[PDB]
């Protein structure tokens, strides 16, 4: 799937990836576009960060910093015990507010590949409020409510597709993304690297948390 077009307020029943080939050919010509799309009740998992900073100044949020953020949600995936057996390749997307406006940031992590139901993504978001290393990687990030960031609504609001934004606001840019490879072969074992060329991708399909006809983004169904 359901997407919303915010500044019409026409939502569709969708042809998927021919839609959102649209949306890229549109997002890579600079469009403006307000594109939600439902999470409903079985889709990837988006975590929507509403930053509060110490400062005015975007935190760096570098790659290493990405990838102990994504081994953190990964446990938590990973401990909500839906994951299926086997390896399986699941992608960490960082969408970045693209400046901190009165010390207020934000970013989106995306793993639209995950397919959960809405009550393992509430789970989920939950466990991370006791994660006290994600608190304390955005403590050091500059952020002031580090314990609160998190926004406990990740799970039901709908998801801005990629280049998409709200009314007044400009549209989250994805920083960069990150392939992880969990295998219950081998459980330690969590490889976290950036993905390479994820501009060669539709990012728009990619990122979608309902789609699953992406090319670098294979659905990985959860129980
Ligand atoms: N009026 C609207 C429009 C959209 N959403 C959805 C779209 C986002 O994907 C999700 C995240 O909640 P936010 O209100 O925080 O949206 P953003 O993260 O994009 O904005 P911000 O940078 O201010 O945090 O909520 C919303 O809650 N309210
Ligand atoms: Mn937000
Ligand atoms: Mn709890
Ligand atoms: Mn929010």
């Given at each position: ?13 969708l ?10 050919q ?6 403006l576009?307000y ?17 509060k ?17 994504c ?15 086997g390896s ?16 207020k ?30 608190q ?7 952020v ?6 998190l ?6 609001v709908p998801?801005?597709?990629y ?7 400009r ?12 295998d ?8 976290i690297?950036?993905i390479?060329?994820?501009?060669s ?5 990619e ?17």
């Open positions: 799937t359901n997407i919303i077009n915010r500044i019409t307020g026409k939502t569709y029943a042809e998927l990836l021919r839609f959102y080939e649209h949306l890229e549109c997002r890579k010509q600079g469009a576009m594109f939600l799309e439902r999470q409903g009740t079985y889709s990837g998992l988006m975590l929507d960060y509403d930053l900073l110490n400062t005015n100044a975007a935190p760096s949020l570098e790659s290493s910093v990405l990838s102990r953020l081994h953190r949600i990964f446990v938590h995936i990973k401990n909500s015990s839906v994951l299926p057996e399986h390749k699941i992608h960490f997307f960082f969408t970045l507010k693209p400046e901190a406006v009165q010390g940031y934000g970013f989106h992590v995306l793993i639209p590949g995950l397919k959960m139901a809405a009550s393992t993504k509430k789970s989920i978001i939950a466990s991370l409020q006791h994660d006290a290393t994600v304390k990687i955005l403590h050091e990030q500059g002031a409510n580090p314990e609160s960031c926004d406990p609504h990740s799970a039901s998801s801005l597709l280049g998409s934004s709200k009314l007044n606001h549209p989250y840019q994805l920083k960069t993304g990150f392939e992880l490879v969990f219950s072969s081998d459980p330690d074992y969590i490889p690297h950036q390479k060329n994820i501009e991708y539709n990012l728009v399909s990122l979608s948390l309902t789609n699953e006809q992406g090319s670098l983004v294979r659905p990985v169904y959860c129980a």
